[PDB]
Design a protein around this ligand. Structure first.
Ligand code: LV7
Length: 279
C-alpha cells in the first residue's frame, strides 16, 4: 500500500498512537547481559537503553570491551550503521577508540550538548584549532582542522591520531543543530538536505567502516536518520518503490537495537521524511 495513502489514512483517523504501540508490541526482545554487569554501570547513560549482546560493538582491549553501541546491518539495502549514546565524561576515550577500530569516516550528531537546561552529552571534540584533545586512557589525539557553520547544520574536519602508531585519519563531524527541544521539526526539508550532505561526503559508502550516529540515548533521532536513509535507498533499488513498508523496515532495524523511534510524532515525521524524500 503506497505509504503516502497509508499516511493520509492514519492522519485522518488520528491513529498514530495505535500504529506506534503495535510496533512496540511486535518488536524483538534479546538479552543485554554485558550492559547490565555492575562493572559497566557508569558506561551507560540510561538504565532502560542497552545494546543487545548479539549486535553490540566490542572495543579491542582485554580490560573491558564494553560500550553502549550497536551494529545495525541492513542486508538488502547494503548499508551498515553504528548507533551509540551521547558520550559520557568517562566514555569519551572509548567513543574515539570505537571510531578508530571500526574505520568510520563520519560521525553524525543529532543533539546539542545542552537541551532543556541539562547536559545531553560530553563536549567530546575540540572547539579551537590550537587547543587539541588527548584521551590518555585510549592513547588518541584529536585536532580541529576546519569548521563550516550553516543555518541548520555545522560540518567539521577533525584529525584523529593513534599516538601508538602515529597513523592519522580525517574524520568528518556532521552536527544537526536545529532539532527542537520538544516535538519534531515541522518540515523535514532541512533534515533531508542534512542527510544528502552526509551521503555526498562518502561517509555512508562501503569503502569505509560504518558511520557512527548518536543523539542523547541513540534510539530516537538516531532511529529517524537510519530508517529514512534505508527506506529511500530501498525505493531506488526495488522494481516497485510502493513495496517499501516503513513499519517492516523499522521492525527489522529493531532486531539490532531496542527502542528505535521513541514517540508517535517521530514515527509520523519518519513517514514525512521518506514521503517528501521520494519527490
Ligand atoms: C531524493 C531527494 O529528494 N534528495 C534530496 C532531498 C532534499 C534535499 C536535497 C536532496 C538531494 O538530492 N541532494 N543531492
Amino acid at each position: 500500500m503506497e505509504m503516502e495513502k497509508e499516511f493520509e489514512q492514519i492522519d485522518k483517523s488520528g491513529s498514530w498512537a495505535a500504529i506506534y504501540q503495535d510496533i512496540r508490541h511486535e518488536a524483538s526482545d534479546f538479552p543485554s547481559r554485558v550492559a547490565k554487569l555492575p562493572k559497566n554501570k557508569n558506561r551507560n547513560r540510561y538504565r532502560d537503553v542497552s545494546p543487545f549482546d548479539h549486535s553490540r560493538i566490542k572495543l579491542h582491549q582485554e580490560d573491558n570491551d564494553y560500550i553502549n553501541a550497536s551494529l545495525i546491518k541492513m542486508e538488502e539495502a547494503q548499508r551498515s550503521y553504528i548507533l551509540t549514546q551521547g558520550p559520557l565524561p568517562n566514555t569519551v576515550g572509548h567513543f574515539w577508540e570505537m571510531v578508530w577500530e571500526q574505520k568510520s569516516r563520519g560521525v553524525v550528531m543529532l543533539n546539542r550538548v545542552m537541551e532543556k537546561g541539562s547536559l545531553k552529552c560530553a563536549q567530546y571534540w575540540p572547539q579551537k584549532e590550537e587547543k587539541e584533545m588527548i584521551f590518555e586512557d585510549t592513547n588518541l589525539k584529536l585536532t580541529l582542522i576546519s569548521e563550516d557553520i550553516k543555518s541548520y547544520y555545522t560540518v567539521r574536519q577533525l584529525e584523529l591520531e593513534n599516538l601508538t602508531t602515529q597513523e592519522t585519519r580525517e574524520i568528518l563531524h556532521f552536527h544537526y543543530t536545529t532539532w527542537p527541544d520538544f516535538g519534531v521539526p515541522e518540515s523535514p526539508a532541512s533534515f533531508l538536505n542534512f542527510l544528502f550532505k552526509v551521503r555526498e561526503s562518502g561517509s555512508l559508502s562501503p569503502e569505509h567502516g560504518p558511520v557512527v550516529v548518536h543523539c542523547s540515548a541513540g534510539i530516537g533521532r538516531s532511529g529517524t536518520f537510519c530508517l529514512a536513509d534505508t527506506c529511500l535507498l530501498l525505493m531506488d533499488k526495488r522494481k516497485d518503490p510502493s513495496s517499501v513498508d516503513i513499519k517492516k523496515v523499522l521492525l527489522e532495524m529493531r532486531k539490532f537495537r531496542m527502542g528505535l523511534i521513541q514517540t508517535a510524532d517521530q514515527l509520523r515525521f519518519s513517514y514525512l521524511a521518506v514521503i517528501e524524500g521520494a519527490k
